[PDB]
Amino acid sequence: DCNELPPRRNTEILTGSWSDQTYPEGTQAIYKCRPGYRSLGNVIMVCRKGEWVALNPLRKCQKRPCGHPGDTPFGTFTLTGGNVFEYGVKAVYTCNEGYQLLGEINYRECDTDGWTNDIPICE
């Protein structure tokens, strides 16, 4: 039986009511995949032997994909923060030598629910 409360994590958050130091063994803790993160299901931990262990150790909340930021036949972009479209990358838009772009924001960033900006036009 638990003699400590379940922890809170970086990529995961406790979802449920926890208010006592001592919980019965076999109690699972359902974790939130933070806004901007996901897993597949939820990160389920469970109290076993007095400690909180991972019922599902395969589960953890990792970055969520953003999908396509919008491509263009003319122009390029580079990702900073990763090489994939995930929460945290900035798609720094680049262009051919002859152009720059329209807009003030020459990039797109991955926020919780997707990209912050649209497709900058090479001009």
From Swiss-Prot:
Compartments reported by the entry: Secreted
Domain Sushi stretches: 1-63, 64-123
Post-translational note: Sulfated on tyrosine residues. Another study observed glycosylation at this position.
Coiled-coil parts of chain: none
UniProt superkingdom: Eukaryota
Disulfide bonds: 2-47, 33-61, 66-110, 95-122
Organs and tissues of expression: Expressed in the retinal pigment epithelium (at protein level). CFH is one of the most abundant complement components in blood where the liver is the major source of CFH protein in vivo. in addition, CFH is secreted by additional cell types including monocytes, fibroblasts, or endothelial cells.
Physiological role: Glycoprotein that plays an essential role in maintaining a well-balanced immune response by modulating complement activation. Acts as a soluble inhibitor of complement, where its binding to self markers such as glycan structures prevents complement activation and amplification on cell surfaces. Accelerates the decay of the complement alternative pathway (AP) C3 convertase C3bBb, thus preventing local formation of more C3b, the central player of the complement amplification loop. As a cofactor of the serine protease factor I, CFH also regulates proteolytic degradation of already-deposited C3b.
Associated clinical condition: Basal laminar drusen: Drusen are extracellular deposits that accumulate below the retinal pigment epithelium on Bruch membrane. Basal laminar drusen refers to an early adult-onset drusen phenotype that shows a pattern of uniform small, slightly raised yellow subretinal nodules randomly scattered in the macula. In later stages, these drusen often become more numerous, with clustered groups of drusen scattered throughout the retina. In time these small basal laminar drusen may expand and ultimately lead to a serous pigment epithelial detachment of the macula that may result in vision loss. Complement factor H deficiency: A disorder that can manifest as several different phenotypes, including asymptomatic, recurrent bacterial infections, and renal failure. Laboratory features usually include decreased serum levels of factor H, complement component C3, and a decrease in other terminal complement components, indicating activation of the alternative complement pathway. It is associated with a number of renal diseases with variable clinical presentation and progression, including membranoproliferative glomerulonephritis and atypical hemolytic uremic syndrome.
Subunit and interaction comment: Homodimer. Also forms homooligomers. Interacts with complement protein C3b; this interaction inhibits complement activation. Interacts with complement protein C3d. Interacts with CR3/ITGAM; this interaction mediates adhesion of neutrophils to pathogens leading to pathogen clearance. Interacts with complement factor I. (Microbial infection) Interacts with West nile virus non-structural protein 1 (NS1); this interaction leads to the degradation of C3.
Description of its domains: Sushi 1-3 domain represents the minimal unit capable of cofactor activity. The property to discriminate self surfaces from non-self surfaces depends on the C-terminal region made of Sushis 19-20.
Protein name per the record: Complement factor H
Species of origin: Homo sapiens (Human)
Gene that encodes it: CFH
